[PDB]
Amino acid sequence: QVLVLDGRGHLLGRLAAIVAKQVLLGRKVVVVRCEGINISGNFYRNKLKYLAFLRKRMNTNPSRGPYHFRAPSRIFWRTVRGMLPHKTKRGQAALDRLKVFDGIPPPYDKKKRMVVPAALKVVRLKPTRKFAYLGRLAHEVGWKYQAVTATLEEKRKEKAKIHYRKKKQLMRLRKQAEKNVEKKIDRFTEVLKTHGFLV
Amino acid sequence: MKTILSNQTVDIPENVDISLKGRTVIVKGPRGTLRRDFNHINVELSLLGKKKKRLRVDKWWGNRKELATVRTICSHVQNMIKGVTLGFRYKMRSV
């Protein structure tokens, strides 16, 4: 029903395009952890592109002008808006299927998350190149909450490793019982083996 | 062009022991220990001999620039061994 995407290790534009397509096609999409997003090109290169945008503003009343959002969440939004017909209705509903966040909030910290192999950095670039993190970049241009958002992900990790040990414990038990009562399930095991399961 | 292989080697004296978690070198000796990472070069490091006598660094399929790094790793290691075994002293004068 609903699709969730961890953005750690992705690239900005190659992700956005895949999103905008699905979104127009009825799907509801949720992008998470937008501070892990990377960009091609070194830091200085990319900083200028953003700072040059901050010097575009209506001379006569910049209470009206281009609004220069700072956060990683809102930047990824502002990107995708460049790939849609936002000045028409079906464009405007598309935006309202998308939710973006920075960090992993409580609804979605207990759900499995997807990845695209087509917009990853290890796949689309050569390792002898440069790249930049969008989290750092916002901090330099006035994003004020890089520092608590860190503490909150730490606490998240401190609880997930708990969950995995429980899950990792139980697998041992699942596996031990199999080899104990094998004499009782020896018949139903075979047919699975004959048809491509359990082998 | 591209070339298939380039490699270079470094020896170790008996007093010293080193180890590696991939591209993360651990040195230890008389004057303590040192730790340094080379996870940004893309080479293969190996360590062979009786009690790891000798080290070689090698690279496959590289350009002119990418080959230039192979000796540079080795030069750093010679410096680290020397420091933990002997230690560096620089003198400065006033005028």
Binding site: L24, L25, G26, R90 | -
Partner: protein
Amino acid sequence: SGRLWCKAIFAGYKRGLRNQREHTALLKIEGVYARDETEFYLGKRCAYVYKAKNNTVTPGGKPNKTRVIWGKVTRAHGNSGMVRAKFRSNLPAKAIGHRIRVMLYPSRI
């Protein structure tokens, strides 16, 4: 006691860039992402269902509020599992991105 139909998405009309030919449609099917694997779904009947304010007839039932438009799958729109289709009365354009049904009836399997 369950679903007996395959699911699809109404993506838009046949078009160029600055024109439309509203008398034929394009359809995006699930699991179908290559031209080689569309020959199954040829000749088969489609449908777009919706609910209206007034009651209407039903064959073998009481007058519920549903309504349909019928179809026929025709051919393939290029390399990637997209499809073309035609109906009786051209679609409304509020259906874009919604769900239509692909049946299995003219079987040759």
